[PDB]
């Protein structure tokens, strides 16, 4: 899988880790056969329910996973409280609960999710670092002023239109 350890885990190492063939390199580690089958099956369940909340608009792009999501989550939770209970007896991570409970509801309500993700914010932070070096003034007083301005200019459509150069 060509992966290297992380302190805090970025979502990129999460995308390499979540894949089935990633669960393959670990399936080889666990001596027990039925365990080896169990977590594998778990991961395929997860690949089936992930695009629902990851994809921008599942109502079109991935309909069948969406309609089967409730049943699929049921199956998932069953498998957890079945073979893994020792680690889920009295404790569940906030997100595993949130993703196994309220997803179908909010996708029904907003119409879609993941288009609303923090990603469109967050990413922007990268800019805030470079715009604090390249385009900064630089002194404490004016710095936020010209970062903010230059950022605004970066974001505008009017310019990007020009930078497409019409094919």
């Amino acid at each position: 899988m060509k992966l290297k350890p992380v302190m805090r885990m970025n979502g990129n190492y999460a995308r390499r880790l979540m894949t089935r063939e990633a669960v393959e390199a670990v399936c080889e580690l666990v001596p027990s056969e039925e365990r080896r089958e169990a977590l594998l099956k778990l991961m395929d369940l997860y690949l089936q329910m992930k695009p629902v909340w990851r994809s921008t608009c599942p109502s079109r792009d991935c309909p069948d996973q969406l309609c089967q999501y409730s049943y699929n989550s049921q199956q998932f939770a069953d498998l957890l409280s079945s073979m893994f209970k020792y680690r889920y007896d009295g404790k569940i991570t906030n997100y595993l609960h949130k993703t196994l409970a309220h997803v179908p509801e909010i996708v029904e309500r907003d119409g879609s999710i993941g288009a609303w993700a923090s990603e469109g914010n967050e990413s922007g932070n990268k800019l805030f670092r470079r715009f604090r070096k390249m385009n900064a003034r630089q002194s404490k007083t004016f710095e936020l002023e010209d970062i903010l301005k230059h950022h605004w200019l970066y974001t505008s459509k009017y310019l990007q239109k020009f930078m497409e150069a019409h094919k």
């Binding site: 009295g90 609960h97 909010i106 288009a115 923090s118 914010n121 805030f128």
Partner: protein
């Protein structure tokens, strides 16, 4: 031209390890908070009849190409006092704005917009801390539901979203 509906996704997230400048003053913490928004869609309704009608929808919302910075601060996420002190006015214009419809001169003509604000971009710890919850590992896990830790242990796949602003206030 007067029946528009504008849906704006706003997001606010913090950032650590930003080194202070020698500068003059005043003394300021290292961490910086970036408050932004993005226009997800703009649609239409009138004459009446049909629904609301999409016109423009951001094709790649996740791109950093469209995220519009608004409030830029040096604030530690942990101190609430200052965070609410600076973000107070901003929220005030929002909840004052939801009521009133905008009038712009565009395409030559005077037209009117309704704004629908959805803050969806906040991380769980921030949602919790602006909503007054106990973060982040407290017995009550769901921001959207009333389930405790152990209660969400036995039962999982069946839950009903309750938690909403007005309810939290009351």
């Amino acid at each position: 031209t007067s029946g528009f509906t504008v849906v704006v996704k706003e997001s606010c997230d913090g950032m650590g390890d930003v080194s202070e400048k020698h500068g003059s003053g005043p003394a300021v913490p290292e961490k910086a908070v970036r408050f932004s928004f993005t226009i997800m869609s703009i649609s239409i309704r009138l004459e009446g009849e049909d629904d609301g009608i999409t016109i423009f929808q951001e094709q790649k919302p996740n791109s950093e190409l469209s995220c519009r910075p608004l409030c830029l601060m040096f604030v530690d996420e942990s101190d609430h006092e200052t965070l609410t002190a600076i973000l107070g006015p901003v929220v005030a214009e929002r909840k004052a704005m939801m009521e009133s419809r905008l009038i712009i001169s565009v395409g030559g003509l005077l037209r009117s917009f309704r704004f629908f604000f959805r803050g969806t971009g906040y991380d769980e710890k921030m949602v919790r801390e602006m909503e007054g919850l106990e973060a982040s590992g407290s017995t009550y896990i769901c921001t959207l539901c009333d389930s405790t830790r152990a209660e969400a242990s036995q039962n999982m796949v069946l839950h009903s979203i309750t938690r909403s602003h007005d309810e939290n206030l009351e």
